């Protein structure tokens, strides 16, 4: 028990996860004017194989689209990294309002929702398990969602939610390339942070997309419609899962433009 409500939410997490009060916590607010242009940065290059898509699962606090990672069939290369990271998942972050659900913030501004595309260093570690705790183990792309116009590339994801209504339900989810969800240009901010929920490892190199993608209120309504309870129990909706921002504490956020 760790959640997003008062008794076990983000303000309490530290009682248990002392690393909550670390020096590399995420999300952070991004101050555009204090960011630092690094000419060593490369374009990120994604290469997913839609055939790696596996399942979609309800984890109570969120939902997950999991990927087969026994190969280098779906990888991320470029940006800051000199080796390649293997794709293992995507998931979203939202809030109880359609207007305030992002984790990362830009210049004090909170977006409606956030997608995270997570990878691990296959070059260096043997599994996600090993990798998960090391300084350079994970890399996540974060895409800011802005409420507006319906985003039709999210349809295959929403139809799938029907089958994963309550906690612990899984379903097959295949032939899906997540790179369909990224913005048009892939310019980014990067900083050293961590997972945005327990275990809160500071094992993540973030990549925030300069560009946002859309979603409508009703799409968003859908996420918030899943349940956190097991089937047969009283309904408890998946209202929100976003962490407030954390002091930057000496960290530098670099830009690829
Ligand atoms: Zn996330």
- Is 196 annotated among the ligand-binding residues? yes
| Separation CA 77–CA 148 (nearest Å) | 31
Residue 95's DSSP bridge partners are none
| Separation CA 132–CA 257 (nearest Å) | 29
- Is 64 annotated among the ligand-binding residues? yes
What's the CATH number where 229 sits? 3.10.200.10
- Is 240 annotated among the ligand-binding residues? no
Kindly list the distances between the CA atom of residue 61 and the CA atoms of 104, 110, 158, in Å, as whole numbers in the listed order. Answer: 18, 20, 17
Experimental method: X-ray
CB atoms within 10 A of CB 18: 10
Q: How far is CA 149 from the centre of its chain?
A: 21
**Number of domains observed in the structure of the chain:** 1
| Separation CA 86–CA 46 (nearest Å) | 10
Residue 237's DSSP bridge partners are 227
**Residues in contact with 157: Cβ distance below 8 Å, sequence separation at least 6, in sequence order:** 56, 65
CB atoms within 10 A of CB 237: 13
**Residues in contact with 70: Cβ distance below 8 Å, sequence separation at least 6, in sequence order:** none
Kindly list the distances between the CA atom of residue 250 and the CA atoms of 21, 28, 137, 193, in Å, as whole numbers in the listed order. Answer: 14, 12, 21, 12
**Residues in contact with 116: Cβ distance below 8 Å, sequence separation at least 6, in sequence order:** 90, 91, 92, 93, 140, 141, 142, 196
Distance 196 CA to ligand 1 centre (A): 6
Q: Is the peptide bond before 27 cis (omega within 30 degrees of 0)?
A: yes
Specified resolution (Å): 2.2
Distance 117 CA to ligand 1 centre (A): 8
Q: Is the peptide bond before 153 cis (omega within 30 degrees of 0)?
A: no
| Separation CA 12–CA 124 (nearest Å) | 34
**Is 61 an annotated catalytic residue?**
yes
CB atoms within 10 A of CB 121: 22
| Separation CA 22–CA 202 (nearest Å) | 8
Distance 151 CA to ligand 1 centre (A): 20
- Three-state SS at 15: helix
Domain of residue 146, residue span = 1-257
């Amino acid at each position: 028990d760790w959640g997003y409500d008062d008794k076990n939410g983000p303000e309490q997490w530290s009682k248990l996860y002392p690393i909550a009060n670390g020096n590399n916590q995420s999300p952070v607010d991004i101050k555009t004017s204090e960011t630092k242009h690094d000419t060593s940065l490369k374009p990120i290059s994604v290469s997913y194989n839609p055939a790696t898509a596996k399942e979609i699962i309800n984890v109570g606090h969120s939902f997950h689209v999991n990927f087969e990672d026994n190969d280098n069939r779906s990888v991320l290369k470029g940006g800051p990294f000199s080796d390649s990271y293997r794709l293992f998942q995507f998931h979203f972050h939202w809030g109880s309002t359609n207007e305030h659900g992002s984790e990362h913030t830009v210049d004090g501004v909170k977006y409606s929702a956030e997608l995270h595309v997570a990878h691990w260093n296959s070059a260096k570690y043997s599994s996600l398990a090993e990798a998960a705790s090391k300084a350079d183990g994970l890399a996540v792309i974060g895409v800011l969602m802005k409420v507006g116009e319906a985003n039709p590339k999210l349809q295959k994801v929403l139809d799938a939610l029907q089958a994963i209504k309550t906690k612990g339900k899984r379903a097959p989810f295949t032939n899906f390339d997540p790179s369909t969800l990224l913005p048009s240009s892939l310019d980014f901010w990067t900083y050293p942070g961590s997972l945005t929920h327990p275990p809160l490892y500071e094992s993540v190199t973030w990549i925030i997309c300069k560009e946002s993608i859309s979603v409508s209120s009703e799409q968003l309504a859908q996420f918030r419609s899943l349940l956190s309870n097991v089937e047969g129990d009283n309904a408890v909706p998946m209202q929100h899962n976003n962490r407030p921002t954390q002091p930057l504490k000496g960290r530098t956020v670099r830009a690829s433009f």
